[PDB]
Design an enzyme around this catalytic site. Sequence first.
Site, PDB file in Angstrom:
ATOM      1  N   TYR A 137      27.441  17.652  34.458  1.00  0.00           N
ATOM      2  CA  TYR A 137      27.397  18.510  35.640  1.00  0.00           C
ATOM      3  C   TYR A 137      27.607  19.978  35.259  1.00  0.00           C
ATOM      4  CZ  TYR A 137      28.247  20.753  40.056  1.00  0.00           C
ATOM      5  OH  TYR A 137      28.194  21.618  41.141  1.00  0.00           O
ATOM      6  N   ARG A 184      40.890  25.481  38.840  1.00  0.00           N
ATOM      7  CA  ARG A 184      41.595  26.454  39.678  1.00  0.00           C
ATOM      8  C   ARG A 184      41.318  26.247  41.164  1.00  0.00           C
ATOM      9  NH1 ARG A 184      38.700  31.753  39.067  1.00  0.00           N
ATOM     10  NH2 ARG A 184      37.463  30.639  40.654  1.00  0.00           N
ATOM     11  N   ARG A 194      34.266  19.568  49.175  1.00  0.00           N
ATOM     12  CA  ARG A 194      33.616  19.365  47.875  1.00  0.00           C
ATOM     13  C   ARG A 194      34.601  18.793  46.865  1.00  0.00           C
ATOM     14  NH1 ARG A 194      28.794  22.128  46.760  1.00  0.00           N
ATOM     15  NH2 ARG A 194      28.384  20.411  45.298  1.00  0.00           N
ATOM     16  N   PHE A 254      30.173  41.980  28.003  1.00  0.00           N
ATOM     17  CA  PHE A 254      29.676  41.103  29.055  1.00  0.00           C
ATOM     18  C   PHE A 254      30.086  39.641  28.804  1.00  0.00           C
ATOM     19  CE2 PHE A 254      26.461  37.989  30.108  1.00  0.00           C
ATOM     20  CZ  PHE A 254      26.261  38.203  31.476  1.00  0.00           C
TER      21      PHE A 254
END
Length: 335
Positions: A137, A184, A194, A254
Amino acid sequence: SLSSSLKTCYKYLNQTSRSFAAVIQALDGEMRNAVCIFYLVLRALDTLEDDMTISVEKKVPLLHNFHSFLYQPDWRFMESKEKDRQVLEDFPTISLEFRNLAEKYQTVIADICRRMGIGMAEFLDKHVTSEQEWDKYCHYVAGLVGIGLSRLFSASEFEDPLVGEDTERANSMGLFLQKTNIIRDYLEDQQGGREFWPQEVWSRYVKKLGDFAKPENIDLAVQCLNELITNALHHIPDVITYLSRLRNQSVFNFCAIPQVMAIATLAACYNNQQVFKGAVKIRKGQAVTLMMDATNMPAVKAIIYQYMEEIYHRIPDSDPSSSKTRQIISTIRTQ
């Protein structure tokens, strides 16, 4: 002298990525627009996936065919009830700028969107059961983003071909972030109906994942929390290897900032009952400091080691995962 549509795209980037938009906007050369557009296309796809008002019957073809909507100039979606729905309602502005990117970037972005849509659709009819399924997933919703970004960096030639080639390390970058976010966001996800924690893990503690919100089950909840954090830590060696290979400063910043935020978040969550009551977050003050400091590899390693030491010295002897937590931290420290 940015085009009207590209200016709009950067406005949507600031609205959907918030403080991280500036880090994208700092990317050198062609990488800036390519990553901006990639992020917006991904946000649109995620908004479709997330919207529980869209039936599975209707959602599957949307997810499967999403990559092709990039090439359909008037395609938009007006039936979303989600918060980020402006990227779907004004998708034509985003897709126009996508079609203005060089072919080498289009190919990557469309390929990743195709593969993510297939995987997201696969998980509409199942929950995450095993740890292997959790990795799958996470691959579909985040690992592929790490792979796609890496292929954009190599395509731009600001990074070596190795960065795009090593899909194992790129996938690990995404898994670490996504597992951290899932851990978290236990309660927020609960509240939106969910469930992303793997059932083969949580079912060893409680009969329903929602039972961890009940005060009487806090000790079990924290044990499961610690087991999942221990799993997530296993990605750190790959994160370190990936970051160590980056040459361009703008790309380094980044890539490094989200990873340092994630390790700080896992350290904050470790053995922390507050995960089950709502409010474990790295707040903006700490985030600003981490952003400033995470600009080179020795500093990033130092941050990682600091947070690992925080976890290490908080490990309860009685925790079912204590041995495993100590072992992975030993490995990270030794690399």
